[PDB]
Design an enzyme around this catalytic site. Structure first.
Site, short mmCIF file in Angstrom:
data_model
loop_
_atom_site.label_atom_id
_atom_site.label_comp_id
_atom_site.label_asym_id
_atom_site.label_seq_id
_atom_site.Cartn_x
_atom_site.Cartn_y
_atom_site.Cartn_z
N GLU D 150 92.93 95.74 63.20
CA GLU D 150 92.01 94.68 63.63
C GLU D 150 90.59 95.21 63.82
O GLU D 150 90.05 95.24 64.93
CB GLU D 150 92.52 93.97 64.89
CG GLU D 150 93.80 93.18 64.72
CD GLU D 150 93.64 91.97 63.82
OE1 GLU D 150 92.54 91.38 63.80
OE2 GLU D 150 94.62 91.61 63.13
N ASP D 151 90.03 95.71 62.72
CA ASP D 151 88.66 96.19 62.57
C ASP D 151 88.34 97.42 63.41
O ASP D 151 87.18 97.85 63.45
CB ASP D 151 87.63 95.09 62.87
CG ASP D 151 87.91 93.81 62.11
OD1 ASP D 151 88.25 93.89 60.91
OD2 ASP D 151 87.78 92.72 62.71
N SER D 152 89.32 98.03 64.07
CA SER D 152 89.05 99.18 64.90
C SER D 152 88.87 100.44 64.06
O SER D 152 89.22 100.48 62.87
CB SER D 152 90.18 99.39 65.91
OG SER D 152 90.31 98.26 66.74
#
Ligand SMILES: [Zn+2]
Ligand SMILES: [Zn+2]
Ligand SMILES: [Zn+2]
Ligand SMILES: [Zn+2]
Lengths: 49, 46, 269, 533, 48, 98, 539, 116, 67, 97, 98
Positions: D150-152
């Site tokens: 999740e975009d981390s």
RNA sequence: AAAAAAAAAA
């Protein structure tokens, strides 16, 4: 506090009558002076009654 | 104890007691900075 | 149920780089050797910085960070020094730490380059790496600034500091990392199909390959196990690379012996 | 123009020569503008137009300032370009060159900002080369242990210990004396216990003789940093002269609570009113950690999920552990192909030794051309590399995309956003918790929380979060009238003035905001009689 | 601007005054705070 | 179904029965909710607070404390969810313990 | 506003099960729980009040019977450190403490749920990944709130109602709210393929991450010459109990079910699980997503909330550790098609442009008969939009068909993890036609969209059709047209959100006291009858 | 603020035992060993040395969380051979292999330096 | 402001290779030949020298606070 | 200093936010704040027409730089060659005409 | 559904269920039909309002890729929802399907 | 300490 703790059952709305307002008020004689502060002590009948 | 400050443009060791006005005494510049302390603080190199 | 018989052949050795091949050993042993070369191999680096004059253009912690990353020659010293937690001392005994000093005041109109040559050491064996560079009097390279630039100063700025260098390994902090990149490679011809190329013709051949020009992959061998490993250990100047390998194997042996001692201690229950 | 680069043929001479005109947005309806001089040389058999009146100098001048730092913005989706134009103002870097004499309230300065390897020509004029905000970082786009989902992003901990994205947060405080003729008098001096009333529990030993701290002193927690004591008003009571044990009161300036650092600069001057005026600047070190907001130049924002050391990090056959691992699931729904082209041209420009061109609408830069040039340097032509597992040493079965990009650290750290509260100050009106981190305020259990707590059917959690841990109160109510009655708890007496009732008085627990509601309605000539019987 | 003290000064002269040569300006200093005026859209007057 | 979203039938039929309960169209506005027969504190919590409260003042409307928002204002345990009953201690069930 | 609460930025943590939340140590020391003093835990609470506030774990207060509060924030009088039975001690927030976890804005019931505290080292609230779907969290700087109940009845209400495995199934649409997402789903699709053969060593590593394993190793799929397990054979260990399910993979052909190979799939696309062990098929979003009748829905309805909640976390730890062997990565090579496919796509786009030029010519030559129900402009615009959309869909279909099985963009599309067919079409083939309010790019100038075009030009370049893909890059006119197209989504997201929230508040205020009563009827606050049974069936 | 100290990854605390042996109850002759303040290095070597023993049947390590420096091995052997004795034998064989590699590397360094 | 001591991904010492890089750039070399002459064969170290900007030369132009 | 653009006693009828504190976080942030154009339409309009990117902003205002949230399409930034007209007297054009 | 599936042909010719399997099936059907009943005290009005207002946030994903096939005035999306919640006496697009 | 305004995050 030695008073019975009870839950309220209903809220009876209404209009405060002027007689009831005059009875329940702790300012005897009414609020008379607009000056909040009077010489190092609060003034009775004022806005800091 | 009269302590020392640095003039902004003179870079001069001005010294005064803590009631004199903030003023350089050689050029008259209103901003002075406080000198770095003599207390030694330990830094890790991490 | 017994141990392997690892055979080592060294293809290249120089003052900052070793290239060798491990034969007949497991992949876990080689990967753990790479990990203990990167992380748990101890060296000396500066850890205690105290500033008495910092009238330069950079902050205190920035200068402490830049000084702490400087590699130090610690080949003959790090095996005898103890950790600070393992000494009975409190005020930084000479068998616990190495004292460095710096005192540079710029009084000239040109820029003064404060480098590692201005970092004096109390110990005659612990020096910055530029002791290897100042002896090159055959300098046809054209530039004598071969030293690690700590800071630049203009006129009127000074830098005075006292520092203590401690013993540590790269697991604690990356300034104690003795290596500068450990290349580790097994099966260059993809004979085991551990990785899958969608187009094997699009991939350049490795330097340890055994295939000719019109072939791109070795034939698949399901019986093959990884027993040949190509290592390239490059030093950052703190330790000699053969000393990196020897001290890494010694640290691994000490860790395994400590685990064995703790297991035999808990066995009597 | 090459000899105005020598001497004097400026742009005003070029406009005055009659080759460049200023066409406004109302004259554009009556002119024909060529996109390029390539459009002028077309043969008339297939010519789109033959009567051209103007020609664009370059189409990349249609962008702004923050949008022209994007490498290849014509390969990205447009909302991603809008997101990067929003987040370019929130990047971190050297904002000005004379920051050592400036004293701003909040400042963020990176240690080692670098100019991008993949630049646009428009950043030659925005002076982004001379004052950059960001770091060229080796990034690998793969799935490693699931902590980058999740975009981390996953940071290299050894790189961070080597100086990756380390920064300094400067915070300034200010104070001033007041020597107005009709006013209380305050002075800059170190406060004393026997002379100052209401002194807060802090460490007052770090101040100098003038109540002003020296630079180089480490400060943390709630350390006092400017000493100011104000003279008390002349309340010389003649009934008891021994009650005036203090003649002054503490009015000092305190450090913010959750911050540590070193005092960077102290200056004293005179303000416009001529009084003494102290301004101090304190620097703190911001090392990147888990949760700090990082972003690409293509709208690929995220936070650090975890940090791995180099021995636990995925690595190539050359021992190259990347700085940052991002997730490939942030690519397809976002369609930031310009991020991948920036990565490829960064690898090519780092291997060749040139600063690559990412000017939009350039036909001289192609993906196939970058691939053909990258193939000559011994790397895979699509930029893939074979990496190995950090923990085990096994080869990764799927080949992975690695290379240098340009990432920007953002100002939204987690240390400026973390907040917790058990019990603290309350408001003076409703006796509910305060607002904000700085005033140590609680969280807002709003209406929608009440809605879905109703939806859960949890009555006791609602009663807790809306009566027990917000503002409980006990009132004494006349049974006959239902209004608030007089209750003296010392001698245990109850009296209703409006009913002359002394015995039939009940006690009701209720929120304090309900009590203000009832008293405000009693000021509205409304009697909300709580019939407790 | 034209009427400020930093008009047409060199980089050395700006550095001697502790000012950034890359500072574009374009802002006022009101009570020590840097204030910028945002351009406001409006309909064109005297247009049918 | 234009957007392809699926909601269960009970959550829709409940709203369709709430609006058609009074015999006419009871809209979800301030003209359909505040015109109901509910309490004063329930109606004043949504919209037109002062008007609803002063109409209940002028008409002496009794709020019977049956809604959820009314008990939220009172701070009592609301007669809803898991607070829709009372727990009584069984005197004769107190058998052998410790 | 509440008292005992916290709020911080969230970061992912796949090693946490779904009923757990990672809590920082500073938040755990600041937040307290008033545990009652019993004879069961008298020694532990005595050592807790002896440790004080300086050390974690510890305590901050003793709340005794008469309401007196004894501070432990300052070593107080050893005579005040007396723990009687019935006293309350506000201890620090330790492990396995039930808390309430909330993201704002709160849209539905599952936007604030119960969790169990695990105290972790750094400073962000680390939650699991399957909880991203009900919270609508994105891990891009999202802040999120935590509430600590202060009584054991509220703690039991959090345990028995609010907890995460009890909130799996939406009452909104009788479907699960939490599904297997991102690279967990991608590696589920990549593991359960037919060709995945896993050695003994990798199976014995992967079985360490399955805590519900019964320590009995399954017999290998292949016994000679080398013992090998398959991906389905180790996914069968993850699936608990008696779970039986038949679904289809996303690339299942429609004519396979009527063929002779219905129960033996050539492409392994018929997913079938019998007796809780996976037998056939490659799992995807259809099998392990939020859809009705999926594996998560079936195991929840057949096994209960606790076994399903453990099954949510048992997939991720095995799958993310097999992904360390496999790996997954997108790159610039995944967006480049074959040169023959590129030539076919460009020829199809040029043929579509010639078709729309011919349509413009026949409309100018008075040869376009308008359809009934609309005028000539509407007929012309419908024909042009149909031609350009058919061109974009056909080129995207050819581009998706031409991709190999090693393409990772296609892998994430067919896994359902991220992306769709329009993303493949716009990245590889062509972006397509830009639309403002469902129409052509309007004539902002006098009969021109841009000053570089000619007046009264209805061709696809001036109209706004983008013939270039994102890989090829956009021409400046179509870049500006795509900017106008992309602005409309941001505009539509802003304007609406206000009236949507107002509609939600109105709906929740009209129906806030409607409750199923004990006679089965459904009544409002005034006792007026609404439904004789809830949903007309009482279920 | 909440950054843990960097020396907790390799240093035991006060009263923290390094090895915690736990007997398994599901099957016979199985043990779960928990080693604190270590990482994938020792676990990978010990497991891949254990798998060369024919007398073991199951051997697998796991790091339960990257933020907790701790790893476990499950070892299940035959009914003539303790798992703890297998862990002894794996450690002893790894020590012998590393000592042999150390002396071979020293000999190779010596012959490479003296050979020119 | 100043050149880092070590490469970020790599750990190779680059603090001694900035003044030499500037001298090789101003002599006659290109950037690629200068980086090859300095010995930085990996592009992880070449991005540390190609992208670096020297902001300490602008900071040194300001007059110091103390004379 | 305040930004209320009018009389101090009658600041309620004046526009707010005309003068803003200069953003000093990066150099690009300062350059974007110095080249900002504000639309006088309030940030509560349900109408989408003033927020759309018009055709006539080609090379005059930046198409891809708008704030997120309720102020989308109203606050905008100048293009790189956008030159605002200073103003001039219309006399000598009239005498020449 | 019970009679159409538990018929005497399917359980004998197709399913071939045994005796004890049939009583196990009957007991499980009865138990899980008991478990599926709505709990008294469950707040279904707020649940219905949230389960109907939550899809309204997702009624913008089909905004693009629209051209129009019929030239019929129809209000779609959240404002059409606004026309049905508010009971608008003048709809924006009134239409009869004859 | 309050009130107002502005800039932002999801
Ligand atoms: Zn002076
Ligand atoms: Zn010592
Ligand atoms: Zn009364
Ligand atoms: Zn390097």
């Amino acid at each position: 506090s030695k008073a019975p703790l009870r839950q309220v059952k209903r809220v009876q709305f209404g209009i405060l009558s002027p007689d009831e307002i005059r009875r329940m008020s702790v300012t005897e004689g009414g609020v008379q002076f607009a000056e909040t502060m009077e010489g190092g002590r609060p003034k009775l009948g004022g806005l800091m009654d | 104890t009269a302590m020392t400050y640095i003039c902004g443009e003179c870079h001069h060791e001005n010294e005064m007691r803590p009631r004199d006005p903030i003023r350089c005494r050689e050029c008259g510049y209103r901003i002075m900075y406080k000198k770095r302390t003599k207390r030694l603080v330990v830094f890790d190199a991490r | 149920p017994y141990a392997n018989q690892p055979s080592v052949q060294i293809t290249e050795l120089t003052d900052d780089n070793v290239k060798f091949v491990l034969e007949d050993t497991e992949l876990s042993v080689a990967n753990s050797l790479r990990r203990v070369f990167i992380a748990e191999t101890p060296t000396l680096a500066i850890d205690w910085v105290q500033l008495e004059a910092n009238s330069t253009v950079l902050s205190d912690e920035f200068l402490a960070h830049r000084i702490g990353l400087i590699p130090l020659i610690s080949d003959d010293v790090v095996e005898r020094l103890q950790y600070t937690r393992d000494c009975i001392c409190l005020d930084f005994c000479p068998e616990c730490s190495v004292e460095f000093t710096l005192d540079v005041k710029c009084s000239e109109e040109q820029t003064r380059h404060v480098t590692t040559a201005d970092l004096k050491s109390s110990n005659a064996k612990v020096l910055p790496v530029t002791s290897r560079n100042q002896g090159e009097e055959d300098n046809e390279y054209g530039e004598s600034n071969d030293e690690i630039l700590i800071i630049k100063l203009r006129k009127g700025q000074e830098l005075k500091l006292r520092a203590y260098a401690k013993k540590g390994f790269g697991k604690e902090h990356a300034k104690w990392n003795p290596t500068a990149g450990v290349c580790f490679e097994y099966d260059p011809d993809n004979s085991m199909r551990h990785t899958l190329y969608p187009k094997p013709d699009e991939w350049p051949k490795s330097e340890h390959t055994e295939l000719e020009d019109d072939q791109y992959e070795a034939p698949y061998n399901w019986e093959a196990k990884p027993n040949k490993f190509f290592f390239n250990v490059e030093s950052a100047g703190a330790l000699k690379p053969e000393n990196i390998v020897v001290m890494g194997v010694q640290v691994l042996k000490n860790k395994l012996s400590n685990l064995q001692t703790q297991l035999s201690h808990e066995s009597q229950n | 123009l090459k000899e105005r680069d020598y001497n004097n043929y400026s742009w005003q001479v070029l406009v005055a020569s009659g080759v460049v005109e200023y066409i406004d947005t109302l004259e554009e309806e009556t002119v024909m503008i060529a996109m390029s001089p390539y459009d002028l040389k077309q043969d008339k058999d297939y010519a789109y137009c033959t009567t051209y009146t103007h020609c664009e100098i370059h189409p990349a001048m249609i962008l702004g300032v923050c949008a022209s730092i994007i490498p290849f913005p014509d390969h990205n989706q447009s909302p991603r370009n809008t997101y990067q134009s929003a987040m370019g103002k929130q990047a971190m870097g050297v904002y000005i060159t004379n920051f050592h004499v400036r004293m701003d309230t909040l400042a963020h300065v990176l240690y080692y900002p670098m100019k991008p390897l993949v630049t646009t020509r428009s950043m030659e004029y925005l002076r982004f080369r001379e004052l950059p905000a960001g770091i060229n970082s080796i990034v690998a786009i793969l799935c490693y242990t699931g902590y980058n989902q999740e975009d981390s992003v996953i940071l290299n901990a050894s790189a961070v210990e080597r100086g990756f994205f380390r920064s300094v947060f400067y915070r300034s405080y200010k104070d001033s004396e007041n020597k107005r003729v009709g006013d209380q008098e305050e002075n800059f001096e170190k406060p004393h216990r026997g002379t100052c009333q209401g002194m807060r529990n802090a460490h007052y030993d770090k101040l100098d003789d003038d109540g002003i701290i020296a630079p180089g002193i480490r400060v943390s927690g709630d350390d006092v940093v400017i000493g100011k004591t104000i003279t008390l008003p002349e309340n010389d009571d003649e009934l008891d002269s021994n009650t005036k044990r203090f003649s002054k009161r503490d009015a000092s300036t305190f450090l913010r609570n959750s911050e540590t650092g070193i005092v960077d600069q102290v200056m004293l001057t005179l303000n416009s009113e001529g009084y003494k005026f102290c301004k101090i600047r304190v620097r703190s070190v911001r090392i990147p950690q888990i949760g700090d907001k990082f972003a690409s130049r293509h709208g690929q924002k995220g936070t650090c999920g975890i940090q791995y050391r180099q021995e636990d990090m995925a690595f190539t056959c050359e021992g190259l552990a990347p700085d940052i691992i991002i997730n490939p699931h942030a690519i397809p729904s976002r369609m930031t192909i310009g991020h991948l082209i920036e990565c490829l041209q960064g690898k090519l420009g780092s291997n060749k030794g040139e600063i690559g061109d990412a000017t939009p609408f350039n036909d001289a830069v192609n993906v196939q051309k970058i691939s053909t040039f990258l193939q000559e340097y011994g790397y895979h032509l699509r930029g893939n590399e074979v990496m190995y597992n950090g923990h085990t040493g096994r080869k990764i079965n799927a080949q992975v995309f690695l290379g240098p990009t340009y990432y920007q650290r953002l100002k939204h750290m987690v240390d400026d956003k973390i907040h917790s509260r058990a019990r603290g100050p309350v408001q003076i009106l409703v006796r509910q918790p305060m607002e904000g981190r700085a005033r140590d305020g609680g969280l807002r259990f709003g209406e929608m929380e009440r809605d879905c707590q109703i939806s859960h059917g949890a009555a006791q959690f609602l009663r807790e979060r809306l009566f027990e841990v917000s503002d409980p109160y006990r009132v004494h109510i006349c049974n006959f009238c239902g209004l608030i009655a007089i209750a003296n708890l010392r001698n245990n007496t109850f009296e209703c003035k409006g009913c002359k009732n002394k015995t039939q008085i009940s006690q009701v627990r209720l929120p304090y905001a309900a009590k203000l509601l009832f008293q405000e309605l009693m000021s509205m000539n409304i009697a909300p009689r709580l019939m407790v019987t | 601007s034209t009427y400020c003290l930093l008009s047409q000064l060199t980089d050395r002269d700006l550095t001697e005054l502790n000012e950034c040569p890359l500072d574009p300006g374009g802002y006022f200093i009101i009570n020590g705070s840097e204030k910028v005026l945002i351009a406001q859209e409006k309909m064109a007057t005297n247009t049918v | 179904q234009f957007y392809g979203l699926y909601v269960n039938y009970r959550h829709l039929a409940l709203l369709c029965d709430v609006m058609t309960a009074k015999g006419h169209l009871m809209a979800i506005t301030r003209h359909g909710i505040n015109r109901q027969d509910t309490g004063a504190l329930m109606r004043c919590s949504f919209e037109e607070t002062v008007d609803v409260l002063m109409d209940a003042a002028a008409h002496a409307e009794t709020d019977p404390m049956r809604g959820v928002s009314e008990n939220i204002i009172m701070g009592q345990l609301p007669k809803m969810g898991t607070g829709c009953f009372d727990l009584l201690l069984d005197a004769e069930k107190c058998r052998f313990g410790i | 506003r509440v008292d005992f609460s916290a709020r911080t930025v969230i970061t992912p943590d796949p090693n946490l099960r779904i009923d757990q939340v990672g809590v920082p140590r500073s938040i755990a020391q600041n937040l307290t729980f008033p545990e009652l003093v019993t004879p069961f835990n008298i020694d532990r609470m005595q050592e807790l009040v002896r440790r004080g506030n300086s050390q974690y774990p510890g305590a901050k207060y003793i709340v005794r019977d008469n309401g007196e509060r004894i501070d432990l924030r300052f070593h107080p009088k050893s005579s005040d450190l007396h723990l009687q039975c019935g006293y309350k001690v506000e201890r620090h927030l330790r492990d396995d403490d039930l808390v309430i976890f909330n993201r704002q804005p709160t849209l539905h019931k599952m936007s604030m749920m119960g969790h169990r505290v695990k105290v972790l080292p750094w400073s962000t609230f680390r939650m699991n990944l399957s909880c991203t779907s009900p919270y609508n969290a994105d891990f891009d700087g999202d802040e999120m709130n935590l509430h600590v109940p202060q009584s054991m009845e509220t703690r039991a209400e959090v345990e028995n109602i609010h907890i995460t495995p009890r909130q799996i199934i939406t009452p909104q649409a009788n479907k699960p709210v939490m599904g297997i997402v991102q690279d967990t789903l991608t590696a589920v699709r990549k593991m359960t393929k037919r060709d995945v053969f896993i050695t003994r060593e990798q199976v014995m590593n992967l079985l360490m991450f399955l805590p519900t394993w019964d320590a009995k190793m399954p017999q290998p799929c292949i016994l000679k010459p080398r013992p090998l397990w398959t991906g389905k054979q180790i996914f069968s260990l993850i699936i608990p109990g008696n779970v039986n399910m038949i679904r289809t993979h996303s690339t299942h052909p429609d004519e396979e079910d009527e063929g002779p190979y219905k129960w033996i799939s050539p492409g392994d696309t018929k997913v079938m699980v019998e007796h809780g062990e996976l037998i056939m098929g490659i799992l995807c979003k259809k099998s392990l997503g939020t859809s009705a009748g999926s594996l998560l829905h079936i195991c929840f309805l057949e096994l209960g909330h606790d076994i399903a909640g453990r099954f949510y976390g048992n997939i991720q730890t095995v799958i993310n550790n097999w992904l360390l062997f496999e790996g997954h990565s997108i790159g610039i090579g995944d967006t480049i098609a074959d040169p023959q496919t590129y030539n076919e796509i460009q020829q199809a786009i040029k043929k579509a442009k010639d078709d729309v030029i011919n349509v413009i010519q026949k409309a100018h030559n008075m040869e376009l008969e308008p359809t009934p129900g609309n005028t000539l402009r509407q007929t012309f615009e419908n024909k042009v939009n149909r031609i350009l959309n058919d061109a974009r869909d056909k080129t995207g279909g050819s581009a998706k068909k031409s991709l190999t099985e090693y393409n990772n963009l296609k892998a994430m599309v067919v896994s359902g993890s991220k992306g769709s067919n329009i993303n493949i079409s716009q990245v590889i083939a062509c972006v397509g036609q830009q639309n403002v309010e469902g129409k052509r790019i309007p004539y902002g100038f006098r009969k021109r969209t841009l000053p570089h075009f000619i007046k009264d030009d209805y061709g696809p370049e001036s109209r706004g059709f983008v013939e270039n893909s994102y890989l090829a890059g956009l021409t400046p006119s179509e870049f500006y047209f795509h900017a106008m197209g992309g602005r409309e989504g941001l505009i539509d997201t802003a304007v609406k959100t206000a009236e949507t929230g107002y509609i939600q508040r109105r709906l929740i205020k009209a129906m806030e006291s409607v409750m199923v009563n004990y006679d089965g009827t459904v009544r409002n606050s005034v006792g007026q009858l609404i439904q004789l049974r809830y949903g007309e069936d009482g279920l | 603020m909440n950054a843990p100290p960097t020396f907790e990854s390799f240093l035991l605390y006060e009263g923290e035992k390094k090895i915690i042996k736990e007997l398994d109850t599901k099957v016979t002759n199985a043990a779960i060993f928990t080693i604190n303040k270590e990482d994938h290095t020792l676990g990978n070597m010990i497991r891949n040395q254990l798998l060369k023993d024919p007398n073991v049947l199951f051997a697998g390590y796991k790091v339960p969380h990257p933020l907790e420096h701790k790893f476990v091995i499950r070892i299940q052997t035959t009914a003539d051979y303790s798992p703890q004795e297998a862990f002894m034998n794996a450690i002893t064989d790894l020590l012998a292999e590393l000592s042999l590699f150390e002396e071979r590397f020293k000999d190779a360094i010596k012959e490479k330096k003296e050979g020119g | 402001m100043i050149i880092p001591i070590r490469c970020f991904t790599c750990g190779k010492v680059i603090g001694n290779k900035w003044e030499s890089y500037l001298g090789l750039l101003q002599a006659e070399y290109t950037e690629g030949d200068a980086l090859d002459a300095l010995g930085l064969k990996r592009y992880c170290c070449r991005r540390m020298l190609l992208g670096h900007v020297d902001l300490i030369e602008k900071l040194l132009n300001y007059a110091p606070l103390e004379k | 200093a305040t930004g209320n653009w009018g009389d101090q006693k009658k600041a309620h009828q004046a526009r707010a936010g005309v003068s803003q504190v200069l953003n000093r976080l990066t150099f690009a942030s300062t350059l974007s704040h110095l080249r900002r154009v504000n639309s006088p339409i309030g940030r509560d309009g349900k109408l989408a027409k003033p927020r759309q990117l018009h055709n006539t902003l080609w090379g005059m205002l930046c198409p891809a730089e708008t704030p997120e949230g309720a102020a989308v399409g109203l606050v905008k930034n100048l293009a790189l060659m956008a030159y605002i007209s200073v103003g001039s007297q219309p006399s000598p054009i009239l005498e020449f005409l | 559904l019970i009679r159409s599936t538990l018929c005497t042909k399917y359980v004998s010719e197709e399913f071939r269920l045994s005796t004890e399997a049939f009583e196990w099936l009957v007991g499980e059907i009865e138990t899980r039909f008991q478990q599926a009943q709505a709990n008294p005290g469950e707040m279904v009005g707020a649940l219905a309002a949230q389960s109907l207002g939550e899809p309204a946030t997702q009624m913008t994903l089909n905004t693009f890729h629209f051209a129009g096939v019929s030239s019929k005035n129809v209000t779609l999306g959240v404002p059409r929802l606004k026309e049905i919640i508010n009971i608008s006496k003048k709809p924006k697009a009134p239409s009869l399907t004859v």
